[PDB]
């Protein structure tokens, strides 16, 4: 399974051994990066003018002048051939030769190559990743790993633009990077070049830029500094800003100035890209004409980025046609998946889908904006690389599975199981959702409805859920201890813990359904309650970011199933034995009674999704949003004036909608 799949491929049953004795032709002429790969593959073998001939080089080189008619005439294209006599590795250009070797490495199996003939090239000119999310920027080591990953999957673009990098955005975009960061960026560019990736440094000056000579010159000075560090591609982002920086005329004038006074003056600058303020259709204002102004004034060689019909959306034919009409050029797609900086309590490990597969000529580029979890994002990145190179042959599920098997060969099935139930985003402001747990969804839906109505559920459906919960535990435990991709495991470990707890809770609830005698049911009930508390603990101690703290997993299908199944069987138990067991599905140490919604704890905040009772006395900070008071014993009370009032560290245990307290 070659990924990306080549444009043209012909194979037949013939096994060629990786020759013990080879003759390299064009090792001096070909792309040095491609040669280094070939020599690592050919290491151990003998090099001489005897044995099998191996021709490598670019179109025009002496080594492959013979096969020049087979070499596709596209950028980054190449021709690859293997048979009993000769191996050919000829690129249309140097990057093409490199890509020929990346395919060749996939063909090599047990030192045996298939008799194949390949003519290949990308359908989309620029393909890769934009690190453009809010949150903790990728570590240096993560980025180094990413760049090698891009090379292997023929992604030629990495756009550096972490929103929370102070030297990328306001106010310190005017300042050069410190020596430490500068040295690191320098290395990244070098490693990017070694993997045939264009390192595109982006700048985000819009929020506080003044349209004068001072800021213009400082921007160019900053660009000049990056150039000295080795950067040869550049970008200017005007996304998520207000004020004068949103002026389309001024944006275009600035980019054209950069183009003519810097990009065209330098001898070796490649990509020049801008992200508009109106970067999707829904945010595009029809009463004005921001986009058509950019389209007309911005020099045509300059790329304009676009996220689709919405901030989070999949690219359609009518969608790309709509934007292209206005910007007078093929849009440079910025796809906001698997970025999760607005649902930071979720991992988005599902397959890549939704994007039209016939519109390759309608886009100048396609890059993905990923999670701040770098390794975890490789599932989607690997898939986008496949899609972008050969959209006509893009296989959603096969590529997903191939990605997982590549990222974690030693535990691919376990990672599949985990990712299968960690793909949906849950409710969010963008209304963007993904499928999850569709394998077991039908059995869960039938089981629960039959259980609710008091009908007999299918034995098969019950056993499916049992198998699933069991498999989830195996996967969670094996993943925790996996040492093949340690950085990956560090990223997902909190979710894996929550994942196992979900599975354990699921098992115990099904036993409550199966349960015959009373004391056994009660044992299971108490165990579930304890597991709920454990999930609460993880939710409060892991991933404690300011926006969506905590750890959520298997939210679309499985947790609702377990919660509703637990509530129902407890309800039936109370009816039967005249008991009054609590059917609460999520642990909450605090309480709230009123003239009624579930409470939630987020960081040092207690909130309603009336009287609240905390599990202890804390110093109060404020109460942001019958009377309004506070108390420590629930007998004596103390009123506060809402001016959303302050508490001034006053001891509080009762409150009569968010309460903030001190640690």
Residues catalogued as catalytic: 240
Q: Does the protein bind ligand XRJ through residue 128 (CB under 6 A)? A: no
Q: How near is the Cβ of 392 to ligand XRJ at its closest, in Å?
A: 26
Q: Does the protein bind ligand XRJ through residue 334 (CB under 6 A)? A: yes
Is the N-terminal amide bond of 532 cis, ω within 30° of 0?
no
Instruction: Taking the CA atoms of 32, 37, 38 and 42 in sequence, report the sign of the dihedral they define.
Output: positive
Q: Does the protein bind ligand XRJ through residue 117 (CB under 6 A)? A: no
Tell whether residue 341 is among the known ligand binding residues. yes
Stretch that binds ligand XRJ, among 129-137, 198-206, 468-476, 536-544 (CB under 6 A): 129-137
CB 471 within 8 A of CB 479: no
Nearer to ligand XRJ, 206 or 295 (CB): 206
Tell whether residue 324 is among the known ligand binding residues. no
Nearer to ligand XRJ, 331 or 614 (CB): 331
Find residue 130's DSSP bridge partners.
Answer: 159
Closest CA relative to residue 543, chosen from 496, 501, 503:
496
First-to-final CA distance of the chain = 54
Query: According to DSSP H, which parts of 1-130 are helical?
Result: 32-42, 94-107
- Which pair of tokens denotes residue 304? 């304009």
Q: How near is the Cβ of 130 to ligand XRJ at its closest, in Å?
A: 8
Tell whether residue 31 is among the known ligand binding residues. no
In the block, residue with structure tokens 């249309």 = 92
Pairing, β 638-639 against β 629-631: antiparallel
Q: What is the DSSP letter of 43?
A: T
CB 305 within 8 A of CB 275: yes
Q: Does the protein bind ligand XRJ through residue 342 (CB under 6 A)? A: yes
Stretch that binds ligand XRJ, among 7-15, 127-135, 207-215, 651-659 (CB under 6 A): 127-135
Give the residue, chosen from 133, 138, 158, 451, that forms a contact with ligand XRJ under the rule CB under 6 A: 133
Contacts 24+ apart (CB under 8 A), 524-529: 525/570, 525/573, 525/581, 528/566, 529/582, 529/587
> Could you give the CA distance from residue 333 to residue 128 in angstroms, rounded to a whole number?
10
Nearer to ligand XRJ, 240 or 611 (CB): 240
Q: Does the protein bind ligand XRJ through residue 278 (CB under 6 A)? A: no
CB 254 within 8 A of CB 220: no
Nearer to ligand XRJ, 52 or 371 (CB): 371
Q: How near is the Cβ of 165 to ligand XRJ at its closest, in Å?
A: 12
> Could you give the CA distance from residue 639 to residue 652 in angstroms, rounded to a whole number?
12
Give the residue, chosen from 6, 132, 351, 370, that forms a contact with ligand XRJ under the rule CB under 6 A: 132
Q: What is the DSSP letter of 111?
A: T
Tell whether residue 83 is among the known ligand binding residues. no
CB 226 within 8 A of CB 203: no
Q: Does the protein bind ligand XRJ through residue 336 (CB under 6 A)? A: yes
CB 46 within 8 A of CB 116: no
Q: Does the protein bind ligand XRJ through residue 238 (CB under 6 A)? A: no
CB 603 within 8 A of CB 661: no
> Could you give the CA distance from residue 635 to residue 618 in angstroms, rounded to a whole number?
17
Q: How near is the Cβ of 343 to ligand XRJ at its closest, in Å?
A: 9
3-state secondary structure of 44: coil
Q: How near is the Cβ of 424 to ligand XRJ at its closest, in Å?
A: 17
Q: Does the protein bind ligand XRJ through residue 437 (CB under 6 A)? A: no
Using CB under 6 A as the binding rule, the residues of this chain from 584 to 613 that contact ligand XRJ are none
Tell whether residue 132 is among the known ligand binding residues. yes
Q: How near is the Cβ of 4 to ligand XRJ at its closest, in Å?
A: 24
Give the residue, chosen from 74, 163, 471, 564, that forms a contact with ligand XRJ under the rule CB under 6 A: 163
Q: What is the DSSP letter of 262?
A: I
| Number of chain residues interacting with ligand XRJ (CB under 6 A) | 17
- Which pair of tokens denotes residue 500? 């196992």
Tell whether residue 369 is among the known ligand binding residues. yes
Q: Does the protein bind ligand XRJ through residue 240 (CB under 6 A)? A: yes
3-state secondary structure of 312: coil
Q: Does the protein bind ligand XRJ through residue 371 (CB under 6 A)? A: no
Nearer to ligand XRJ, 134 or 353 (CB): 134
Nearer to ligand XRJ, 77 or 132 (CB): 132
Stretch that binds ligand XRJ, among 48-56, 80-88, 338-346, 486-494 (CB under 6 A): 338-346
Give the residue, chosen from 116, 202, 275, 659, that forms a contact with ligand XRJ under the rule CB under 6 A: 275
Using CB under 6 A as the binding rule, the residues of this chain from 61 to 100 that contact ligand XRJ are none
Per-residue interface string for the shown chain with ligand XRJ, residues 165-204, x marking contact by CB under 6 A = ----------------------------------------
Q: Does the protein bind ligand XRJ through residue 239 (CB under 6 A)? A: yes
Q: Does the protein bind ligand XRJ through residue 311 (CB under 6 A)? A: yes
106-119: buried (b, 16+ CB within 10 Å) or exposed (e) per residue? ebeeeeebeebbbb
Nearer to ligand XRJ, 369 or 423 (CB): 369
The number of angstroms, rounded, from the C-alpha of 242 to the middle of its chain's C-alpha atoms is 27
Q: Does the protein bind ligand XRJ through residue 279 (CB under 6 A)? A: yes
Nearer to ligand XRJ, 189 or 252 (CB): 252
Q: Does the protein bind ligand XRJ through residue 310 (CB under 6 A)? A: no
The number of angstroms, rounded, from the C-alpha of 504 to the middle of its chain's C-alpha atoms is 28
Q: How near is the Cβ of 137 to ligand XRJ at its closest, in Å?
A: 12
With a CB cutoff of 8 Å and minimum separation 6, the contacts of 435 are: 350, 423, 424, 556
> Could you give the CA distance from residue 423 to residue 216 in angstroms, rounded to a whole number?
43
Nearer to ligand XRJ, 133 or 138 (CB): 133
> Could you give the CA distance from residue 508 to residue 513 in angstroms, rounded to a whole number?
9
Nearer to ligand XRJ, 275 or 661 (CB): 275
DSSP string for residues in 351-382: ----S-SS-GGGEEEEEE---S-TTTTHHHHH
Tell whether residue 335 is among the known ligand binding residues. yes
Q: Does the protein bind ligand XRJ through residue 120 (CB under 6 A)? A: no
Q: How near is the Cβ of 364 to ligand XRJ at its closest, in Å?
A: 15
Please give the helix or strand (H or E) that residue 70 lies within, else none. Answer: none
Which residue of the chain is nearest ligand XRJ when measured via CB?
133
Q: Count CB atoms within 10 A of the CB of residue 488.
A: 21
Q: How near is the Cβ of 447 to ligand XRJ at its closest, in Å?
A: 36
Q: Does the protein bind ligand XRJ through residue 339 (CB under 6 A)? A: yes
Q: Give the distance between the most distant pair of CA atoms in the chain.
A: 98
In the block, residue with structure tokens 């039209």 = 356
**Site residues, ligand XRJ (CB under 6 A):** 132-134, 163, 239-240, 275, 279, 305, 307, 311, 334, 336, 339, 341-342, 369
Could you list the residues known to form a binding site for a protein, using ranges.
132, 163, 239, 279, 334-336, 341, 369
Could you list the residues known to form a binding site, using ranges.
132, 163, 239, 279, 334-336, 341, 369
């Amino acid at each position: 399974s070659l990924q990306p799949p080549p444009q043209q491929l012909i194979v037949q049953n013939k096994t060629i051994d990786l020759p013990a004795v080879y003759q390299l032709n064009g090792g001096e002429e070909a792309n040095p990066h491609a040669v280094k790969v070939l020599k690592e593959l050919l290491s151990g073998k003998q090099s001489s003018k005897k044995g099998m001939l191996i021709s490598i080089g670019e179109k025009g080189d002496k080594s492959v002048r013979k096969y020049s008619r087979q070499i596709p005439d596209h950028k980054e294209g190449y021709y690859l051939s293997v048979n009993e006599k000769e191996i050919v590795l000829a690129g249309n250009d140097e990057r093409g030769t490199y890509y020929a070797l990346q395919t060749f490495a996939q063909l090599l199996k047990d030192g045996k190559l298939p008799e194949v003939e390949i003519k290949d090239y990308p359908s989309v000119r620029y393909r890769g990743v934009v690190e453009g999310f809010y949150g903790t920027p990728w570590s240096h080591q993560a980025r180094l790993s990413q760049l090698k990953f891009y090379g292997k999957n023929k992604m030629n673009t990495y756009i550096y633009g972490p929103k929370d990098d102070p030297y990328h955005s306001a106010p310190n975009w005017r300042l050069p990077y410190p020596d430490k960061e500068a040295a690191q960026l320098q290395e990244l560019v070098a490693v990017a070049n070694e993997n045939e990736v264009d390192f595109v440094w982006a700048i985000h000056p819009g929020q506080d830029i003044k349209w004068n000579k001072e800021d213009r010159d400082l921007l160019l000075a900053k660009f000049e500094k990056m150039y000295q560090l080795g950067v040869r591609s550049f970008a200017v982002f005007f996304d998520d800003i207000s004020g004068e920086g949103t002026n389309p005329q001024k944006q275009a004038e600035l980019l054209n100035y950069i183009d003519e006074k810097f990009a065209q003056v330098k001898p070796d600058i490649n990509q020049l890209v801008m992200c508009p303020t109106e970067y999707n259709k829904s945010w595009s204002n029809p009463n004005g004409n921001y986009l058509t102004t950019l389209g007309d004034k911005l020099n045509p060689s300059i790329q304009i980025m676009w996220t689709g019909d919405r901030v989070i959306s999949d690219i359609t034919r009518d969608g790309i046609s709509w934007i292209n009409e206005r910007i007078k050029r093929p849009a440079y797609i910025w796809w906001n998946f698997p970025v999760s900086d607005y649902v930071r309590d979720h991992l988005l490990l599902g397959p890549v889908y939704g994007n039209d597969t016939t519109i390759a000529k309608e886009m100048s580029g396609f890059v993905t904006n990923p999670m701040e979890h770098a390794e975890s994002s490789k599932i989607a990145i690997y898939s986008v690389a496949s899609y972008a190179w050969n959209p006509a042959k893009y296989d959603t599920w096969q590529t997903w599975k191939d990605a997982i098997r590549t990222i974690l060969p030693s535990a691919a099935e376990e990672l599949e199981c985990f990712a299968m139930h960690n793909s949906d985003l849950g409710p969010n402001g963008h209304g963007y959702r993904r499928e999850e747990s569709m394998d077991i969804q039908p059995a869960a839906e039938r089981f629960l409805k039959a259980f609710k109505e008091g009908k007999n559920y299918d034995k098969a459906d019950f056993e499916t859920l049992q198998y699933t919960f069991e498999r989830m535990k195996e996967s969670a435990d094996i993943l925790l201890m996996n040492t093949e991709n340690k950085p990956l495991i560090v990223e997902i470990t909190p979710w894996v813990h929550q994942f196992k707890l979900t599975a354990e809770m699921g098992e115990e609830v099904l036993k409550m359904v199966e349960g015959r005698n009373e004391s056994y049911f009660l044992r299971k009930y108490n165990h579930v309650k304890a597991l709920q508390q454990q999930m609460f603990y993880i939710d409060q101690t892991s991933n404690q970011n300011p926006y969506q703290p905590g750890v959520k997993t298997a939210t679309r299908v499985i947790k609702p199933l377990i919660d509703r199944t637990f509530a129902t069987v407890v309800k039936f138990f109370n009816q039967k034995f005249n008991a009054h067991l609590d059917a609460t599905t999520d642990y909450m140490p605090h309480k709230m009674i009123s003239n009624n919604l579930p409470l939630q704890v987020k960081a040092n905040r207690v909130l309603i999704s009336v009287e609240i009772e905390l599990d202890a006395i804390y110093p109060g900070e404020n109460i942001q949003i019958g009377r309004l008071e506070i108390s420590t014993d629930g007998k004596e009370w103390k009123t506060v004036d809402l001016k959303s009032a302050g508490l001034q560290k006053a001891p509080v245990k009762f409150v009569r909608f968010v309460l903030t307290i001190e640690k």
